[PDB]
Design an enzyme around this catalytic site. Sequence first.
Site, PDB file in Angstrom:
ATOM      1  N   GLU A  58     -10.318   2.064  36.662  1.00 45.96           N
ATOM      2  CA  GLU A  58      -9.574   3.188  37.204  1.00 45.96           C
ATOM      3  C   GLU A  58      -9.838   3.281  38.702  1.00 45.96           C
ATOM      4  O   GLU A  58      -8.883   3.394  39.492  1.00 45.96           O
ATOM      5  CB  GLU A  58      -9.881   4.460  36.407  1.00 45.96           C
ATOM      6  CG  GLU A  58      -9.417   5.752  37.085  1.00 45.96           C
ATOM      7  CD  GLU A  58      -9.696   7.050  36.320  1.00 45.96           C
ATOM      8  OE1 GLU A  58     -10.437   6.992  35.308  1.00 45.96           O
ATOM      9  OE2 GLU A  58      -9.144   8.130  36.725  1.00 45.96           O
ATOM     10  N   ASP A  88      -7.439  14.749  42.659  1.00 42.59           N
ATOM     11  CA  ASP A  88      -7.784  16.011  42.045  1.00 42.59           C
ATOM     12  C   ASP A  88      -8.966  16.710  42.743  1.00 42.59           C
ATOM     13  O   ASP A  88      -8.925  17.923  42.878  1.00 42.59           O
ATOM     14  CB  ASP A  88      -7.836  15.867  40.517  1.00 42.59           C
ATOM     15  CG  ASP A  88      -9.050  16.516  39.888  1.00 42.59           C
ATOM     16  OD1 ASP A  88      -9.059  17.771  39.791  1.00 42.59           O
ATOM     17  OD2 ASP A  88     -10.002  15.763  39.528  1.00 42.59           O
TER      18      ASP A  88
END
Length: 765
Positions: free
Chosen positions: A735, A538
Amino acid sequence: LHSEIGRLNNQSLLWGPYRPNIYFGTRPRIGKSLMTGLMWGKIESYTDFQHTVRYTCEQNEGMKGYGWDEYDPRRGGIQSIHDIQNGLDITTSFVKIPGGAHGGSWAARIKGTLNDDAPKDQKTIVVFYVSQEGENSELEAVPSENEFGYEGDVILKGRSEALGNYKLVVTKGKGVIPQSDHDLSRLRGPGQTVVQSLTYPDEVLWQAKPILFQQLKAGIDWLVENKYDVADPPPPWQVYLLANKPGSGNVHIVQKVFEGDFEFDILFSSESAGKEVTSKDLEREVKQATEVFGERFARVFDLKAPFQGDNYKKFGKSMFSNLIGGIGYFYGHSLVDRSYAPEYDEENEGFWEDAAEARARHQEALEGPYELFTSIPSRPFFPRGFLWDEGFHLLPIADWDIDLALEIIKSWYNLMDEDGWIAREQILGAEARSKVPKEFQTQYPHYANPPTLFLVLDNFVERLRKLDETLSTASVDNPEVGLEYLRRLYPLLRRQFDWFRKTQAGDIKSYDREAYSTKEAYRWRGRTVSHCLTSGLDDYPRPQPPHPGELHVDLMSWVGVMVKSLISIGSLLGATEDVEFYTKVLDAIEHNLDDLHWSEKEGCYCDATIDEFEEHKLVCHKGYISLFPFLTGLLKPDSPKLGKLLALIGDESELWSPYGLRSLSKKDEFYGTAENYWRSPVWININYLAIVQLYNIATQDGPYKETARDLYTRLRKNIVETVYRNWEETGFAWEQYNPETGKGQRTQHFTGWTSLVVKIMSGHH
């Protein structure tokens, strides 16, 4: 016979604990049907239970850890919950008994052990919650013989078109149940199991916490009206016992209060199968499931050195179980902007300002409903389907049970619209929506996402070229069945292939741009000043400012990934005219990659814009993107380009950390900057890609074979060890991993593509 294997899959998979968003509950793969859910909570005071009760998954200082120790979606497994705040260790054993015509029976044992720091006489409330949706279905508590509730078992009798005739039993259980000396006990009883049978409109049945509290408040209200006051109050746990009111409804609350340790069984018996399911049944089936799981794991996940040890097998088992245990079933409406505004064309400079404004119109509406059967990135934070996340989730699952993987693929592709768009994020149903802030709910038909699912299709085909047991592999073992699947699916792949080309095309022909082909050049729609959501990475640095002249090397390579799959799948079905076009398209992408994206000054691939003076600029940010054509398996092993890349990967001062490959190089001016999602940290999913590619270079006659072998060896070690150290210390998969310190950061319980680590340990790619 194709539909035969299909029919048996439907059956094998129909029941599951497919509610990853809550700690424990079951529901079948049917939109409007029977759902269950477990709640518990210590009660120490007249107010405390509202804060203690557990239901939906969270992660905070209150909870140590939780997840599946073993799990097959076909057999069941065992779940461990370590609840600090409630002094409780919880075990949920779930198990499926094949039988009948309706997708089997099933059983679960709920076991609660106070830890050492809990009072030995802690009072714990436990609720099993049961709901049914549908118009012509019926569910009834057979009422008790005793006055105020149940001295033993609670029997629910139900029927639906979907499930036929069933009965659900909540057993008496083992454990001390507290008795009350109070005046109240004349009317409520001294303490026993109790049931309440309600009906609400179907669409709110899922809201179990509020439904429950509404009854608890109703009870307390009753106490107050009837002169139960502070002069002589009943004990808290008796105040929180519901008045027994069994009967029929779409909602049944079963409530137990326990002093000290406890356990109880839930037995779901399909009428259409043999005799009913009994506690002795559950024990037997659990034990046997554990053994089958043990056995399969050794075959499918044979951990190579230096990770043969027991410590690493425990960790491998946990990473895997959590990944595949996270599978849920979702059903409901999606929220979409079908306005197809002109501003989303992103053809003006300053287009983000335009598209912002189209969004502010708010023409998005609900649609469907749809169903999705999928693994998730994270029970507590992200219990829903994510498009590119799933390509990675299915890589271990495919290994373990290819038929289950193909089921999940099928489910995802059934979401594709007329144009060949699948929303990157599937939020189906009010329950799913409940956990998502409004700003992120709306999906957009011009938002793409890396076609990572193709990568699993890749693995299938290679396996194709070359009863529970049987079904897992049925689609490879029986190649008539194999090819039929790919036959039905192929059109949609092709549709998606074209969709990419129609909507995510970049501009050659209108610019100072020459290349071997004028057709092939790609740009991500969606991008804002600082972001590119749709690429996946992103906040990876991109051309500044964003600009319709952009081309994006990652995107191009993803198209590469698809063409190669279509070529392979095309061949398998002999789409002559189709293969040829793909071969043209491929050949072009190879050339145009080099022409449009390769930097000689920098010795790696780069993104592209056009200038403040309208010519083609390359913009290099040494990092994951820079490696893209490599990561995606597009380069010939003998390539010189390959060479300069392996240089970049290996280079300590660029990408190479003690913990793995950095999203972005320390040399880059944007290292460590902004919010730093992809501007430094270590990501198991991109590292996984690299590792696979290295190993491919490393096991082939060719000039880099030995630089490859050193890199694969060291990366594989680095990646596994970081995930493991962190699992050992914190009990979680994370993550991303800090490049400096090695520590897991961001989202916990991320299983999630961090689970790819079982595939890294087991080698043989």
